[PDB]
Design a protein around this nucleic acid. Structure first.
Lengths: 81, 123
RNA sequence: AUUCCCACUGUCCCUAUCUACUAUCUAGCGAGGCUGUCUGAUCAGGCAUUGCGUAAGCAGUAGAGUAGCCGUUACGAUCUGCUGAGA
């Protein structure tokens, strides 16, 4: 069982997806000991699948955090194509 | 296991269709349960009315007290009786059928309540 | 109830301007356009706590459509000209 603490941010769902890929049940929580103002969340993962041939590209941060594809218009601060 | 882009896009891009699908399923389940409880309510009402009607009848009862014929010319005549009043058969069949039938929470509840109040009064 | 994502904002960087009300003294006493609505209609105006750049009029045979006949009465939004005019 893998128990970790994650700071909630825009890159929080990708970690959950990877954990679901490697674990049979993944679930997050916030124990009362952790202060409510803090953004930390404790996620546990039970039922390790233990693959015979794990994908090294699955645990590589270079592509785990791949960015999602996309009148006084909204300020263009998302870069260019 | 393998790392596939389609699964990660399906998981990340969603989070909203899944919630509305769950809401639709819950709503239709609630509607089905309501229709059920309604029909069993109908059952209870009909049974009450039938029982009171039978009791009324019972308590009023106490207060009460093809032939074919051949001729010599080889010609045959067919004679069948007819029933113009069909009520006799209906009452007889009613009498015949009547004869035939007869979750986990972290802390203590007190501590949980204090924590909830301390979180609530701040806002 | 709490935490993260996007969008917005005078909350702030960082204040500035306007309206209403208030405060002061004196006499006496004294602890151009639009919505709604109204002037019978245009024109021109009033009200709704600023409510939220081409005039009036005339003409055209051009003009969505309303209204006369099987070349043709009339009404007519809109558009064009007098008109960078009118105020």
């Amino acid at each position: 069982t893998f128990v970790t603490k994650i700071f909630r941010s825009k890159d929080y769902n990708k970690l959950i997806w990877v954990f679901q890929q490697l674990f049979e049940k993944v679930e997050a929580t916030k124990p009362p000991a952790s202060r409510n103002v803090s953004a930390e969340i404790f996620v546990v993962c039970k039922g390790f699948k233990a693959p015979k041939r794990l994908d090294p590209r699955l645990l590589d941060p270079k592509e785990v955090f791949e960015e999602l594809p996309d009148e006084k218009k909204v300020r263009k601060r998302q870069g260019y194509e | 296991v393998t790392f596939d882009k389609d699964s990660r896009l399906d998981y990340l891009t969603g989070f909203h269709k899944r919630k509305l699908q769950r809401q639709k399923k819950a709503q239709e389940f609630i509607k089905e349960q309501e229709r059920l409880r309604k029909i069993e309510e109908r059952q209870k009402i009909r049974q009450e009315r039938k029982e009171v009607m039978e009791e009324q009848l019972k308590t009023f009862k106490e207060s009460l007290n093809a032939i074919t014929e051949i001729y010599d010319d080889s010609t045959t005549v067919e004679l069948e009786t007819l029933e113009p009043n069909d009520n006799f058969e209906y009452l007889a069949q009613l009498n015949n059928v009547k004869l035939e039938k007869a979750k986990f929470r972290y802390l203590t509840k007190n501590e949980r309540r204090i924590n909830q109040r301390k979180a609530n009064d701040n806002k």
